[PDB]
Design an enzyme around this catalytic site. Structure first.
Site, short mmCIF file in Angstrom:
data_model
loop_
_atom_site.label_atom_id
_atom_site.label_comp_id
_atom_site.label_asym_id
_atom_site.label_seq_id
_atom_site.Cartn_x
_atom_site.Cartn_y
_atom_site.Cartn_z
N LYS A 118 33.87 38.70 55.91
CA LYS A 118 32.65 38.71 55.09
C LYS A 118 32.88 39.05 53.55
O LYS A 118 34.18 39.17 53.41
CB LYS A 118 31.95 39.85 55.70
CG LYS A 118 32.76 41.17 55.64
CD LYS A 118 32.06 42.47 56.40
CE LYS A 118 32.65 43.69 55.79
NZ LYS A 118 31.98 44.83 56.84
N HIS A 172 23.12 46.55 48.52
CA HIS A 172 22.33 47.53 49.38
C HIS A 172 21.03 47.88 48.54
O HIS A 172 20.06 48.23 49.19
CB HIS A 172 23.09 48.89 49.41
CG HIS A 172 24.34 48.81 50.55
ND1 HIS A 172 25.35 48.31 50.09
CD2 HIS A 172 24.36 48.97 52.00
CE1 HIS A 172 26.29 48.34 51.08
NE2 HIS A 172 25.67 48.62 52.38
N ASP A 224 24.56 39.45 57.04
CA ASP A 224 24.58 40.79 56.66
C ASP A 224 23.26 41.55 56.88
O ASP A 224 22.32 40.84 57.45
CB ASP A 224 24.91 41.27 54.98
CG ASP A 224 25.59 42.34 54.84
OD1 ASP A 224 25.51 43.38 55.75
OD2 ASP A 224 26.02 42.41 53.42
C1 LIG Z 1 27.94 44.25 51.27
C2 LIG Z 1 27.98 45.32 52.30
O1 LIG Z 1 28.79 46.25 52.20
N1 LIG Z 1 27.43 45.13 53.56
C3 LIG Z 1 27.61 45.68 54.58
C4 LIG Z 1 28.40 45.08 55.67
O2 LIG Z 1 29.74 44.90 55.18
C5 LIG Z 1 28.26 45.75 57.10
O3 LIG Z 1 28.93 45.05 58.04
C6 LIG Z 1 27.00 45.89 57.55
C7 LIG Z 1 26.54 46.43 58.77
O4 LIG Z 1 27.01 47.89 58.90
O5 LIG Z 1 26.09 46.77 56.51
C8 LIG Z 1 26.04 46.21 55.30
O6 LIG Z 1 25.46 47.16 54.39
#
Ligand SMILES: CC(=O)N[C@@H]1[C@@H](O)[C@H](O)[C@@H](CO)O[C@H]1O
Length: 526
Positions: free
Chosen positions: A173, A186, A259
């Site tokens: 990722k 986020h 994601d």
């Molecule tokens: C950009 C980032 O950090 N994305 C995270 C990802 O890494 C994680 O696998 C997913 C599930 O918890 O949640 C997202 O917010």
């Protein structure tokens, strides 16, 4: 042969609240036929309980004649873990990058994966192959091995192998690469505006290497890449990025995971249900909806309605189902075992703990110094220790017992360790300035001081006191030094894990030499 509702359910991975399976989890599995479960801290108390929970979820699926489940987690290592009780705390990506050794990334990942598999977890949303070439990146940071494609590819593919050798599907990722972003997906919809030549030589390179060697899954980024996708669609929702670039140009026929769809980049601009549909249309196989049952059901309902209205074809659905079933067979997710964990049991061993300790000894990095820095054992030491008090999933409230002060105390030093907030209160700041008038040897452990002005101001104030011998050691992003021009001695530990603080103590007391090399740049590269 699966019904349409079972096929659609295979495309969704959901979270739930519970140390045992909840009623929501039971309905997701038996009524909505979900293909996967993702764990968070709320599901993870201790190894015996987690192993019981995974076996329970699989039993619920088996007894209701549903496909065995993928069970995933964000167990990246270092500063992003969901369980530390009863398992090895393994160094994280940028700590591994500073040590520079691909073999240690394998061993770190193999420990994580071995322990996860013992708990019934068969998938990990790791490793990040993001390349943190922007020191301002607010969401990656120490979650990246470093700022070059070569280092990230070399360590990242070995992490994939360590996870998958242990029976845990790796998920690289965030494709096609989140390391350059100055914004956090986020909270916003970030853009990586660079030309294709730059994406080919930087962002895409470690993903290509992972795909070439065999990787079970790829997770997308909720980020715009105008050089690939002309429309205002993040990679997660872009057929240009997924079907075109990942599946077509890169030939990837494995599992593609979104994601988390609850993130603002999707939920605020596109919606969860319609984002789910658009993600499948773009080329994704597995729709991640981690938290809210209402949004999980909305995705499931929207996907079913899209097939029933002719928007998503029968072949298209079968295509993703085939990839998910192949992964599930490959990781023998239906396998069982005798219970070996009872309440109170730990997976920690002397051998694994000492192994990761030796990794962190190679990681500690010295970025700036003006001469000798080693602590004088005959004098007291003031250690300023930061703690996260308002958390997120990138920066969690995660208390650490084995602090720098803990290790210095174990070495026989006379330590006053003062815990302050990452955004310290006015009283904490005044308290530290006062104690520094009584204890001249001061070590501040910084924690993203580059993002916390009151923390950086306290450090700069201590650095200006002529009666103070100040050492700063960063325990998250090493880019704190950019905000600390008066500091004379600056170390990077890249995390506040037990083994990183042990190694840092050994450096500061002259027991080991610094061997780490800063793995990401202090100024953005192009
Ligand atoms: C950009 C980032 O950090 N994305 C995270 C990802 O890494 C994680 O696998 C997913 C599930 O918890 O949640 C997202 O917010």
């Amino acid at each position: 042969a699966l019904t349409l509702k079972q096929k659609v359910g295979q495309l969704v991975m959901a979270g739930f609240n519970g140390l045992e399976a909840s009623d929501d989890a039971r309905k997701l599995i038996t009524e909505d036929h979900v293909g996967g479960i993702i764990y968070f801290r709320r599901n993870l108390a201790e190894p015996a309980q987690v192993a019981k929970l995974s076996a329970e979820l699989q039993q619920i699926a088996a007894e209701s004649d549903n496909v065995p489940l993928l069970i995933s987690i964000d167990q990246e290592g270092g500063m992003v873990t969901r369980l530390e009780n009863g398992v090895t705390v393994v160094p994280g990506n940028m700590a591994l990058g500073a040590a520079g050794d691909a073999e240690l990334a394998y061993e770190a990942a193999h420990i994580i994966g071995s322990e996860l598999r013992a708990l019934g977890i068969n998938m990990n949303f790791a490793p990040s192959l993001d390349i943190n070439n922007n020191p301002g990146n607010p969401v990656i940071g120490v979650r990246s091995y470093g700022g070059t494609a070569e280092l990230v590819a070399r360590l990242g593919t070995e992490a994939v192998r360590g996870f998958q050798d242990a029976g845990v599907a790796a998920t690289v990722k965030h494709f096609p690469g989140h390391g350059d972003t100055g914004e956090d997906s986020h909270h916003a919809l970030p853009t990586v505006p660079h030309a294709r030549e730059r994406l080919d030589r930087l962002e895409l390179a470690p993903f290509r290497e992972a795909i070439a060697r065999g990787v079970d899954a790829v997770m997308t980024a909720h980020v715009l890449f105008p050089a690939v996708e002309p429309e205002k669609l993040p990679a997660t929702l872009s057929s240009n990025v997924i079907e075109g670039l990942l599946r077509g140009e890169l030939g990837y026929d494995g599992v593609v995971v979104t994601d988390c769809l609850e993130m603002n980049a999707i939920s605020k601009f596109y919606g969860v249900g319609e984002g789910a549909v658009q993600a499948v249309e773009a080329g994704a196989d597995l729709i991640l909806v981690s938290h809210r049952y209402e949004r999980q059901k909305a995705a499931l309902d929207a996907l079913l309605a899209a097939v029933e209205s002719g928007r998503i074809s029968e072949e298209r659905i079968d295509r993703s189902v085939g990839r998910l079933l192949a992964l599930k067979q490959r990781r023998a997710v239906d396998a069982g075992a005798a219970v070996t964990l009872s309440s109170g049991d730990t997976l920690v061993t002397d051998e694994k703990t000492e192994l990761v300790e030796r990794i962190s000894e190679k990681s500690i990095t010295l970025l700036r110094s003006e001469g000798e820095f080693t602590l004088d054992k005959t004098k007291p030491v003031l250690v300023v220790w930061p703690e996260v008090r308002v958390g997120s999933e990138v920066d969690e409230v995660l208390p650490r017992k084995e602090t720098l002060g803990y290790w210095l105390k174990s070495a026989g030093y006379d330590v006053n360790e003062q815990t302050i907030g990452v955004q310290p209160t006015e009283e904490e700041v005044a308290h530290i300035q006062e104690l520094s008038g009584q204890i001249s040897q001061v070590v501040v452990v910084s924690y993203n001081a580059i993002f916390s002005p009151d923390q950086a101001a306290l450090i700069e104030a201590l650095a200006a006191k002529p009666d103070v011998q100040l050492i700063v050691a960063s325990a998250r992003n090493p880019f704190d030094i950019n905000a600390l021009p008066t500091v004379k001695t600056f170390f990077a530990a890249y995390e506040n894990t037990p083994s990183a603080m042990r190694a840092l103590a050994l450096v500061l007391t002259g027991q080991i030499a610094v061997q780490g090399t800063l793995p990401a740049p202090l100024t953005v590269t192009v």
